[PDB]
Amino acid sequence: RRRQLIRQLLERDKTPLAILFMAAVVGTLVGLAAVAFDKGVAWLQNQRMGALVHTADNYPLLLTVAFLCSAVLAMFGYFLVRKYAPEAGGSGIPEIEGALEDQRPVRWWRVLPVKFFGGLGTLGGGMVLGRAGPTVQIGGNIGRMVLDIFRLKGDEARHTLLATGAAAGLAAAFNAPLAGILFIIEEMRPQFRYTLISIKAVFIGVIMSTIMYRIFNHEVALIDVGKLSDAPLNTLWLYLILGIIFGIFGPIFNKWVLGMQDLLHRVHGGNITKWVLMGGAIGGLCGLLGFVAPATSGGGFNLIPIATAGNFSMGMLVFIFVARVITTLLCFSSGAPGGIFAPMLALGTVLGTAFGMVAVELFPQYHLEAGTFAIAGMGALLAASIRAPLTGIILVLEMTDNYQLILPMIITGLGATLLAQFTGGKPLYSAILARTLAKQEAE
Amino acid sequence: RRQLIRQLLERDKTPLAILFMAAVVGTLVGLAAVAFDKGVAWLQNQRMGALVHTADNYPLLLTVAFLCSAVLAMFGYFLVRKYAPEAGGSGIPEIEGALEDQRPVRWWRVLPVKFFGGLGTLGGGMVLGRAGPTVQIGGNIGRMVLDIFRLKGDEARHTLLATGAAAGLAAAFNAPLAGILFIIEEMRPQFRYTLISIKAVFIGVIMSTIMYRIFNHEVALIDVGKLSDAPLNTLWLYLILGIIFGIFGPIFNKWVLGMQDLLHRVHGGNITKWVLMGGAIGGLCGLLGFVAPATSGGGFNLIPIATAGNFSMGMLVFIFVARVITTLLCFSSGAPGGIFAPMLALGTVLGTAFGMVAVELFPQYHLEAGTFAIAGMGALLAASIRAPLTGIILVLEMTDNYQLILPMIITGLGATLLAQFTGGKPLYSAILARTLAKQEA
């Protein structure tokens, strides 16, 4: 096989020009799509606030239109999914991961409108879910749809345009081009066998998608955290410890998200009406919590900078964490359309901050800032639950821009995946695809 | 499918032994890399102390500048031709070979040969990088602990070989991410599946980078400061720069391949003509290092100067041509030492030059030529080596101008795209191939 190689080596990186051009269009569409999804979710969350001001004096009335506004929008999303596209429940990352294995179908005529409007409801209602998976799935299907429409043939083309769709999808979700590309090559792609996914092509898709996002979202960042202090070498060991803490918690949280899926399934048994009704209840609880304790509901992105800047009491941190584990499991294990990836950012940030707090008072000799531990911990649940640490590290780097924390960030991340492995946890997206692949065969 | 469902549930369970051994490969490669660096530094330094000893007799000082580097050059050419031939050139093609199981890892030979051979060519002030050298050194370190501890299994051989190479590039650049990414973008077997644990490569990279930090803290290889942002309406200029690197990339690849040939005629294969030719090149370098330092040595020094726009357009044109010349002479000659890092200086300079023209052609854009230097730094890496993701992430790690990620990605993609379209090939793949084919003939 020496002679195959010499041939192969000299034929390396020659992606079919058609696949390259089509990547640019998948990128561009996924971009606009993602922008639209974001402005959408924003607007509805905003009307819901304008409605609370309409009734800003009658507290029990305002506690109700806060519930109902989100309850209704929740249901409309649960409904759109149970009725027209069931694969558009949950993240959408397990699903597109499935697709890349050729083990799940890409019914883009159904999921594009279902995910987009269904997500617009759950997210726009202020549920604890991310544009995370949603735009990843949306993007993959966009990729499928141009593959169909232009009738491009070949495995490479199917796998590539599916991959650049998902990567451009995560890029536009976070303004994170590198994190997008990396997610595909670390996690999204078929893990156990070779594939023909052009990286150069994924790159071109990611560029266009990120440029679209920039046309519409320039001048503002999803997280601004400022420039924090450096991390002394003698301070590193504290990050390995935080890594271990995430590493044992990671798997535990994975159990709860899987188990809660089960327990919530009993509430409806499979029935579109019990389900949708259960959805509006969860959704309603969220829109209510969004008024009476906003840090326990919604995306979580708002409280990330507040946590990092150390502006939360230790109590508030403990509160926000427990309350958010609770409402994250309720929202995601329920099957509503929308991911768990992004609410794990807020979860990690909070847990990390808390550790920085204790680290600071235990060692004034180190001149610590709890905010460096928030930043190490931001991608740490991503590392211990999803087991994509390289993506979490690079994502957080793209979002927070504190490169001088790369060593603590890597160390905590590795520490998370290592203790997540060693204590018996599994990659959550892999464990969800598997549950769903083994259910397809179970019946 | 039921295969997948069984596999999915068994995912990311690297054998604890492979994990622990990664930590030790990382730690050794680290110390090794640090030692190689302090070494190269010291010799370059003595050579300067020798020029001060004779600081009045210009034709004498032009001689001990030649000879000091000439001798050290030869000693390196010699150590390679005599004891380990696979330790000529970069060392990346070679470890890439190894990962395909198509080249051998004779660590008992190459560790000392690369390390002291490189110590001579680099420390003599030749135009080569610790680039490949520490990557090869690192892979062999990885091999050597694999042997020593007799770990069995393909995964263990491929992994510990990979973490060695990644920890090696990490330590060479203080670039942990760029290290890991180089393995998954370029170093690993490109055409088939393999069992290289990423988590394990990560652990090796951490330890290696930490070692480098114990000894090199408080200073950065490149400081460039925080440059301006890039307006959306300014992006198209970066796609143009990418195109320019994209057509040049392949041309430069031809020259590095061809010059290998032409320089081989000078010696025919003969250890004495070769080593003697080496000391001549090495001597020319150590001379240029005194009479025009920007045309010789690593190149890292002139990167910040270029980015800050402190070079005339003339000087930029000079430094570029002069450096194409002395890079081909130094690397195509077979001396131990990479082309990866001198391509950084080459791209930076070319980039700056473009920024210069961009600035005066469009004062409406409020440009700073230094943003084009930074987009262009990893652009030869993208158009010649065809590892743009590693180039982009490496430069980001070294220059810390994240607000330039879009221009940097755009120029990079623009490089690989026109490099492909104009018929160039990955230089490390073209060199490994050159060598796997002169082998079965």
Curated annotation (Swiss-Prot), chain B:
It is a multi-pass membrane protein. Pfam families: Voltage_CLC. Induction: By acid-shock conditions. The keyword Cell inner membrane applies. GO terms for molecular function: chloride:proton antiporter activity; identical protein binding; voltage-gated chloride channel activity. Residues 100-106, 150-159, 185-197, 265-270 are cytoplasmic. Chloride binds at S90, I339, F340, Y428. The record marks A131 as: Mediates proton transfer from the outer aqueous phase to the interior of the protein. One of its GO terms (cellular component) is plasma membrane. The keyword Ion transport applies. A motif (Selectivity filter part_3) lies at residues 338-342. The chain crosses the membrane at residues 16-52, 60-83, 107-124, 131-149, 198-215, 236-264, 271-292, 313-332, 338-359, 405-421. Residues 92-99, 160-172, 176-184, 370-384, 385-387, 388-399, 400-404 dip into the membrane without crossing it. It catalyses: 2 chloride(in) + H(+)(out) = 2 chloride(out) + H(+)(in). The record marks E186 as: Mediates proton transfer from the protein to the inner aqueous phase. Keywords: Antiport, Cell inner membrane, Cell membrane, Chloride, Ion transport, Membrane, Stress response, Transmembrane, Transmembrane helix, Transport. InterPro entries: Cl-channel_ClcA, Cl-channel_core, ClC. A motif (Selectivity filter part_2) lies at residues 129-133. GO terms for biological process: cellular stress response to acidic pH; chloride transmembrane transport; proton transmembrane transport. Belongs to the chloride channel (TC 2.A.49) family. ClcA subfamily. Homodimer. Proton-coupled chloride transporter. Functions as antiport system and exchanges two chloride ions for 1 proton. Probably acts as an electrical shunt for an outwardly-directed proton pump that is linked to amino acid decarboxylation, as part of the extreme acid resistance (XAR) response. This is H(+)/Cl(-) exchange transporter ClcA. It comes from Escherichia coli (strain K12). The gene is clcA.
